[PDB]
Amino acid sequence: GAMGSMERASLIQKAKLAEQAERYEDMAAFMKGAVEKGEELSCEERNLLSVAYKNVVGGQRAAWRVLSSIEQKSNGPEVREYREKVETELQGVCDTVLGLLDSHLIKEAGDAESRVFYLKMKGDYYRYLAEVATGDDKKRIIDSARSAYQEAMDISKKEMPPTNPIRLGLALNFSVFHYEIANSPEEAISLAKTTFDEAMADLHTLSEDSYKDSTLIMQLLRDNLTLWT
């Protein structure tokens, strides 16, 4: 890999610089290089990985939606061709992230905090594949997302408090999966509501700073429930 010659510490340092510079493709390439060194990612480093690829794939998803809308409106080959180009690039990014998780972040994740984080990511990047998938490939991809999300949920409920921000962000995203991908809006509402209520009932245990962490994601659960009910 092109980052194979760079020190792990230098890659992490440059990922943080790339974030400051809003250079998210660079950030992701640096974090890919860091992962491929084969050592643990810290909590901070996991967040750097997630930030980098979420920004990369976010730009791709937004472009894909614009082109897909134009394509649907028009129903020459150019719109389809360019949508397919963006789609292929998006799928490649998701494949890369899933490859890092499977080789070997997840199996080497030696506690619940780290394993839940990576399994949430697995669900997210299968979800992004599902958004652009069609037909029978779509069904298998949807099942892979659900399975990863569900395993993360099982661990998080056993090992993390209901206000833990990774647990909350996992539940938020699994609820979006249910509503937008799985045509299960009732499941989506049930999950967002129980997650919100159980976080609220646990806020009394938190410091001012942890309170701010948890209420930030609670806000997003509330916004979805307001959209859905």
Partner: peptide, 6 residues
């Protein structure tokens, strides 16, 4: 579209 955590 709904909000997700990023």
């Amino acid at each position: 579209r709904p909000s997700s955590w990023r």
